[PDB]
Coordinates of all heavy atoms in Angstrom, one line a residue:
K31 N 29.2 -128.9 -56.3 CA 29.0 -129.2 -57.7 C 27.8 -128.7 -58.3 O 27.9 -128.2 -59.4 CB 29.1 -130.8 -57.8 CG 29.1 -131.3 -59.3 CD 29.1 -132.8 -59.4 CE 29.2 -133.2 -60.8 NZ 27.9 -133.0 -61.4
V32 N 26.7 -128.9 -57.6 CA 25.4 -128.4 -58.1 C 25.2 -126.8 -58.0 O 25.8 -126.2 -57.1 CB 24.3 -129.1 -57.4 CG1 24.3 -130.7 -57.6 CG2 24.4 -128.8 -55.8
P33 N 24.4 -126.3 -58.9 CA 24.2 -124.8 -58.9 C 23.2 -124.4 -57.7 O 22.5 -125.2 -57.3 CB 23.6 -124.5 -60.2 CG 22.9 -125.7 -60.6 CD 23.8 -126.8 -60.1
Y34 N 23.2 -123.1 -57.3 CA 22.4 -122.6 -56.3 C 22.0 -121.1 -56.5 O 22.6 -120.5 -57.4 CB 23.0 -122.7 -54.9 CG 24.4 -121.9 -55.0 CD1 24.3 -120.6 -54.4 CD2 25.5 -122.5 -55.3 CE1 25.5 -119.8 -54.4 CE2 26.8 -121.6 -55.3 CZ 26.6 -120.3 -54.8 OH 27.8 -119.5 -54.8
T35 N 21.0 -120.7 -55.9 CA 20.5 -119.3 -56.1 C 20.8 -118.4 -54.9 O 20.6 -118.9 -53.7 CB 18.9 -119.2 -56.4 OG1 18.7 -120.0 -57.5 CG2 18.4 -117.8 -56.5
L36 N 21.5 -117.3 -55.0 CA 21.9 -116.4 -53.9 C 21.4 -115.0 -54.1 O 21.4 -114.4 -55.2 CB 23.4 -116.3 -53.8 CG 23.8 -115.6 -52.6 CD1 25.3 -116.3 -52.1 CD2 23.9 -114.2 -52.7
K37 N 20.7 -114.4 -53.1 CA 20.1 -113.2 -53.2 C 20.7 -112.2 -52.1 O 21.2 -112.6 -51.1 CB 18.5 -113.2 -52.8 CG 18.3 -113.8 -51.4 CD 16.8 -113.7 -51.1 CE 16.0 -114.7 -51.9 NZ 16.4 -116.1 -51.5
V38 N 20.9 -110.9 -52.5 CA 21.5 -109.9 -51.6 C 20.4 -109.2 -50.7 O 19.4 -108.7 -51.2 CB 22.3 -108.9 -52.5 CG1 23.0 -107.8 -51.5 CG2 23.3 -109.6 -53.3
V39 N 20.6 -109.2 -49.5 CA 19.7 -108.7 -48.5 C 20.4 -107.5 -47.7 O 21.4 -107.6 -47.1 CB 19.2 -109.7 -47.5 CG1 18.2 -109.0 -46.5 CG2 18.5 -110.7 -48.3
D40 N 19.8 -106.3 -47.7 CA 20.3 -105.1 -47.0 C 19.9 -105.2 -45.5 O 18.7 -105.0 -45.2 CB 19.8 -103.8 -47.7 CG 20.5 -102.6 -47.0 OD1 21.0 -102.7 -45.9 OD2 20.4 -101.5 -47.6
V41 N 20.9 -105.4 -44.6 CA 20.6 -105.6 -43.3 C 19.9 -104.2 -42.7 O 19.0 -104.2 -41.8 CB 21.9 -106.0 -42.5 CG1 21.8 -105.9 -40.9 CG2 22.3 -107.3 -42.8
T42 N 20.6 -103.1 -43.1 CA 20.2 -101.8 -42.5 C 18.8 -101.4 -43.1 O 18.1 -100.7 -42.3 CB 21.3 -100.7 -42.9 OG1 21.4 -100.7 -44.3 CG2 22.6 -101.1 -42.3
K43 N 18.5 -101.8 -44.3 CA 17.2 -101.4 -44.9 C 16.0 -102.2 -44.4 O 15.0 -101.6 -44.1 CB 17.4 -101.6 -46.5 CG 16.1 -100.9 -47.1 CD 16.3 -100.9 -48.7 CE 16.1 -102.4 -49.2 NZ 16.2 -102.4 -50.7
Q44 N 16.2 -103.5 -44.3 CA 15.0 -104.3 -43.8 C 15.3 -104.8 -42.3 O 16.1 -105.8 -42.1 CB 15.0 -105.7 -44.7 CG 13.7 -106.4 -44.3 CD 13.5 -107.5 -45.4 OE1 13.9 -107.3 -46.6 NE2 12.8 -108.6 -45.0
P45 N 14.6 -104.1 -41.3 CA 14.7 -104.6 -39.8 C 14.3 -106.1 -39.6 O 14.7 -106.6 -38.7 CB 13.8 -103.6 -39.1 CG 13.7 -102.4 -40.1 CD 13.6 -102.9 -41.5
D46 N 13.3 -106.4 -40.4 CA 12.7 -107.8 -40.2 C 13.8 -108.9 -40.3 O 13.9 -109.7 -39.3 CB 11.6 -108.1 -41.1 CG 10.9 -109.4 -40.8 OD1 10.2 -109.5 -39.9 OD2 11.1 -110.3 -41.7
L47 N 14.5 -108.9 -41.3 CA 15.6 -109.9 -41.5 C 16.8 -109.7 -40.6 O 17.3 -110.6 -40.0 CB 16.0 -110.0 -43.0 CG 14.8 -110.7 -43.8 CD1 15.2 -110.4 -45.2 CD2 14.8 -112.1 -43.6
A48 N 17.2 -108.4 -40.6 CA 18.3 -108.0 -39.9 C 18.1 -108.3 -38.3 O 19.1 -108.7 -37.6 CB 18.7 -106.5 -40.0
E49 N 17.0 -107.9 -37.7 CA 16.7 -108.1 -36.3 C 16.5 -109.5 -36.0 O 17.1 -110.0 -35.0 CB 15.4 -107.3 -36.0 CG 15.1 -107.2 -34.5 CD 13.9 -106.4 -34.2 OE1 12.9 -106.8 -34.7 OE2 14.0 -105.4 -33.6
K50 N 15.7 -110.2 -36.8 CA 15.4 -111.6 -36.7 C 16.6 -112.5 -36.7 O 16.8 -113.4 -35.9 CB 14.3 -112.1 -37.6 CG 13.9 -113.5 -37.4 CD 12.9 -113.9 -38.4 CE 12.4 -115.4 -38.1 NZ 13.6 -116.3 -38.3

Side-chain angles (χ1 to χ4, degrees):
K31 183 179 181 296
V32 297
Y34 63 91
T35 302
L36 193 151
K37 58 175 77 68
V38 181
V39 180
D40 183 347
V41 173
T42 58
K43 190 173 73 177
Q44 188 171 333
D46 183 69
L47 289 168
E49 189 177 62
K50 184 178 182 296

